[PDB]
Amino acid sequence: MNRLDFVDKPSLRDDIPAFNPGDTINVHVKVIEGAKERLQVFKGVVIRRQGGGIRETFTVRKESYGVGVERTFPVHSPNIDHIEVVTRGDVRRAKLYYLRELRGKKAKIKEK
Template sequence: MKSTDFVDSQSLRSDIPNFGPGDEVKVHVKVVEGNKERVQVFQGNVIRRQGGGVHETYTVRKLSYG
C-alpha cells in the first residue's frame, strides 16, 4: 500500500449523503478574509460529479432570484 493510499483511506468521510446530477443541495463554504473566518451558504442544483474517494469533485449551479 502506498503512503498516499493510507492517508486517503484515513481522510475519507462516511457521513456524506448520496447525491447526483439534478439534485438540489445546500453548500456551506468556509471563507477566510485576513484573520476573519465565516461560513457562506448557498443553494443550487448539482450539474456534475466526477472522480472518487477523497479526490471526488462536484459542480453546483447556484440558484438566483430576480
Template sequence: MESLIKYVQDEFVSRKELPEFSAGDTITVYYEIKEGQKTRTQFFRGVVIQKRGTGASQTFTIRKMSGTVGVERIFPINLPAIQKIEVNKRGKVRRARIFYFRGLTGKKARIKEAKR
C-alpha cells in the first residue's frame, strides 16, 4: 500500500523548485489570493518554526509578529497558490522545531545569523 501511495505522489503531484530552508530561517512566501474574479499576490514574512512530513504531504510553519500579537501560518509545500519563496536570513538554531520561540519576547527573540 505504501509503495502505491509513493508511486501516485511521484507521478501525479507536481513539484516546484523551491529553495532549501530549515527551522530558524527567515523567509518570505509569496502566494496568490482569489477574491471573487480577481487574484492578487500577498506575502507572509516570518521565521520558520518547523518543517514536518515527507513527500507531497510536507508542510512548514511560519511565525511572525503583527504588532504585539504572534501570527502563525502553516503552508503545504506543494500548495498551488505559492508563487515563490525567498530566504531572507539563515538562522542558527540547535533544534528542528523551535516551539520555545513562541514564549520569547524582545531581544531574547532574536536568532543569530548562520554563516552558510
C-alpha cells in the first residue's frame, strides 16, 4: 500500500497475464504510420520485471538479423493491445542480464 494508490487505481489495466522473467511473450504494439494505425508483434524473452504497480516495466529481448534488440514497455500501457504467453521458462535469476552476452544455442532457456 502507498500514499498515491487512489490516483493510480482508475488507471490500472486488468486482463494482463501473469508472466515471469524467462518466458517467451508476444507483445502487440500499436503503431501509427501516418494515418494507418496498424499493429506490430514483438516476440521475445522476458528478461526483467521492475515492480511498482502503474510504474511497473518489463523488458523483452529478441534476435532480429544477427542483432539483439530489447524493448522496455510499461505494464499497464495503453499502446499494448494484448500480451500472449507463448512459453514458460525455467530460470534461477530475476534480471537475466547474462543473456546480453550469449548467442545462439547458449542463449536458450529451459521449458518449465
